[model samples]
Target chain A: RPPRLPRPR
Target chain B: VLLLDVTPLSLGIETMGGVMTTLIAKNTTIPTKHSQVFSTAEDNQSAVTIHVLQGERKRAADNKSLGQFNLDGINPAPRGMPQIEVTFDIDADGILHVSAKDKNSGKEQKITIKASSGLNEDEIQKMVRDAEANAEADRKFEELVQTRNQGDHLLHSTRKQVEEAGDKLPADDKTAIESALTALETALKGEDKAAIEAKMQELAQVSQKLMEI
Candidate 1:
C-alpha cells in the first residue's frame, strides 16, 4: 500500500 | 505527478493527490516495469535503500510503503543508474500475484517488485455465480414479457423446422433462435438445468438447420 498524506504538500 | 517550483490550483486537486494507494485496488496489467535512476548522495555509500511504494504520489512520504530493497556492493563510481521493475497479475476471480527482483554491482542497480493481493478473492466465485444467475433470470423475464407476446409463433415455427428436418438439422446448419425462445419460457417458469439443457438440445437441432438453409 502507498502511504497516505494528510494533505497535499 | 510532483512538486519542485510547485504549482497549486485548488484544495480539491491537493486533496485528490493526497489519496493513498491501496495494494488490492491496483489493477494495472501484469509484467509492467517502471524504472527510477538514483544518484549516490554521498561518497562510499555501499548500499542504497529503495523504497517501494504503491501510490500515484511522487514523494515517499505520501505513499504506502509496500516494501524495500537494498542495492548493495557499489563500485567506486561517482554516478550510477538504478532500475526498478514491477509486475502484477490477477486470477479469474481477481486474486493478485506479485513478484520482485533486483540487481546491483558497479555502475547501477535494478529493483523489481510484484504483488498479488488475495485480500478480496474469497467472495469472488459466489458473486460471479450470483451474477450469472441474476443475468439469466433477468433475460428470461424480459423474453417472457412478449405478451405471450411473440411466444406462440416462435414455438410453432421452431417445431415445424424440426419436423421438416427429419433427423434434426445438420450440426453445422442448425438455427437456435426458436429453441432459445422456448428455453426463455422454460427459464421464466422455474429454474432447472434439465429444462435448460433440453432447450440447449433444441438449439443444437436448430443450429444444424443452418447447413440445409
Candidate 2:
C-alpha cells in the first residue's frame, strides 16, 4: 500500500 | 393607572413584537400610573403614536414586531415634537391593554384594545377545539376538572363575606349546613379532588340561597 501510494503521482 | 400589564401576546415568539417605548421610563407597581412626553415629527399629524414594539437585537422597526401604535395626536400641522400629548394604557388583571390617547392642545382622545388586534396571529393558529377533539375524552375530563375548580373558587370567594356577615343571623340548621359545606370546601380546595370540591361548592351554593332571603 505504501509503495502504491508513492507510485501514484 | 391600570396596574396589570395585560399583555396577552406572547413574549413566546421572537417575531414582530414592536418595541414598547416608555414615555416615562420608570419601574411602576402594578395598577401604577405614569406619564411621558414625546413630540411630533411632522405637521398636520392627526395621530400621536405610542409605539409598542418587540425585538431580538434587530436593526429595523418593521423587521421586529411592531406591537402596534395608539395615536395620541398633537400634529395635523404642528411641528414635530411641538405639542404635548397625554396617553393612558389601562391594563386588566390578565394584562390586557386598553390604550387611550388625548391631544393636550385639542383635548381630543382615542383608544384601542390590543386584544382585538391582529398582532397575535389569531388567524395563523387553529382553534383549540381541534386539539381537544383529538384526545376528546381525556380533554373533557381535564377541562371539567378545571371548570369545577374554578366554580369552587368562585363560590368560596362569593360567599365568604356572606358567611361572615350572616353566619350568626342564620337559623341553626342553615348555619351548621353552611359551615359544614365551607369546611368540606376548604379541604377540597387543598386537595386535588375536583369532583368533590365542585360538589361541596354546589352544596354551599344551595345553602347560600337560604341566606339570600
Candidate 3:
C-alpha cells in the first residue's frame, strides 16, 4: 500500500 | 607524591640594598637557569655590590635566606640605574645552586655555589619517597571520602531547608520521594564503599537540582 513506503535507504 | 623534584624557593639577586631582583621564581622545573641585569641605586656608584644572592619568596633581601654571594667587582662609575650587573642562576639536577654575576661594561665576573643545606642523605630521600608512594592508594581513598562527605553534607542541608520551606506548597509524593532518596544516601554514606557513596551523593544531588528548579 502507498507504493510500499518508498523502501528505506 | 613520589620522586617529585622542585625548587624549594625563589632565586633572586639582592639589589638596591634589600630589594629582590628575581632571576627565577619558586616552583620552576629542575636543572633550570635564568639571567637578568641589575643597576645601581645611587648616582656615580663605583662599587658593584658583591652579588648577595638569596633564595626565598620575599620582596625584601633581608627576608630571603642567604644562599651565597659573588662580586662583580668592576663596574665603571655611573649614575643611579645606569650600571648593569648581569646576574645568573644555574641549578643542578640534585637541587644544587650555582650563581654568577658580571659587570656589563667592565666584564668583571665571579661565581659561587650554594648548597641546599638540607642534611637528608640520598638514602633518607629515597626512603621518604618510598613511604609516600606506599600510602598513595589509601590517601586517595581518604581524599575522595572527604570530598564525598563535604558534597553530601552541603546538598543535604540545602535540600532539607528547601523541603521544609515548601511545607504547604510541596506535593505529598514529592515529599515522600525526597525522604526516600535522603534515607538511601544516608545509608550509603555509612557504608565503606567509596564508589557507592559517590553514586548516592550524585543521586541526592539530582534530587536537590529537581527541587531547586
Candidate 4:
C-alpha cells in the first residue's frame, strides 16, 4: 500500500 | 446632513489587572474631547502600553479591542512619577482619535478609529471571486482523493494476484510485476493524476499474465 497523502492544512 | 452625534459605546483604556478604565462613556455628546492621566506601575519602565477598547464591560478582556499604542521613550524613574496624558476626541463625522503623550519626554502616539458597516462593490466582487477559487480548489482535492483511492485499490488487488501466482509465475514475469508495483506506489504518492493513471495502466499490463494463471 502507498503511504497516505498528507492532508491539506 | 448636519446633526449631533453620541458615542454608541464606552471607550476606554486597559489598566492594571485587565481593568477597563473608561474615558468616554456611551451616550456622551460629540464632537467632544476627554483626557485622563495614567502612570507606569513598574519602576524604571521606559514604555507604557495604551490599549484602547470599546464596550461597557469592567474587564478589558471582555471588551472589543479597538487597538493599542505605546508611549515610548519615558525617562526611567520610580513608578507613578511619569505623567502620561491620554486623550479621546471625537468629531461630528463619528471619527474618534486616541492619543497618548508622555508629559516629561514630550513623545506621543495616536490612532484614529474608523469602522464601516458593509463592503463596497469592489470588495464584494473580490470576495465572491475568492470564494469561487476556494470552491474550485476543494473540487480538485476531492478528485485527487478519489483518484488516489482508485490507484491504491488497483495496487492491492494486483499485488494479491501476483503473490497467488507465486511459483507458477516465470522469473521474468515476477520481475515485471515487482517493478510495476513499485512504480505505481511511487506515482500514487505524488499529486499528479496523469502520472498515477499512467502507472496504474502499466501495472495492469504486467499483472495480466499472473491474473490469467
The lDDT leader among the candidates is 4
The per-prediction tally of clashing pairs is 25, 28, 0, 0
Give the Cα error of residue B38 in candidate 2, in Å.
1.8
Question: Using TM-score as the measure, which candidate wins?
Answer: 4
List each model's interface RMSD.
11.9, 33.5, 40.4, 23.0
DockQ of each: 0.04, 0.00, 0.01, 0.03
Model 1, B190: alpha-carbon shift in Å? 73
- For model 1, residues B1-213, the per-residue Cα lDDT tens digits are 352311111000011122222233333433332322334433344554544444333223433454544555555343223222223333444333333222354333343333342122444344344435566554544333332323333454556666677655554343346447657567535544345446545655655444454
Predicted complex 2: DockQ: 0.00
Q: After superposition, how far is residue B137 of candidate 4 from its true place, in Å?
A: 48
For every model shown, what is its TM-score relative to the native structure?
0.28, 0.30, 0.41, 0.51
Q: Top DockQ: which candidate number?
A: 1
Scored by CA lDDT, what does every candidate get? 0.38, 0.40, 0.47, 0.72
* Positional deviation of residue B183's Cα in model 2 after best superposition, in angstroms: 81
* Model 3, span B128-179: residue lDDT tens: 4543564564445445554454445455565565667665434754665566
Error of 2 at B124 (Å): 21
List, residue by residue over B1-213, the lDDT tens digit for candidate 4. 576567766788877445567899866887889998887755577888888877655546656688877777889876567888889998777788999888899999898887442234465455445545566654555466567767876876777787777899899888988998899889888878889899989887877678788
**Shift of residue B204 alpha carbon in model 3, Å:** 68
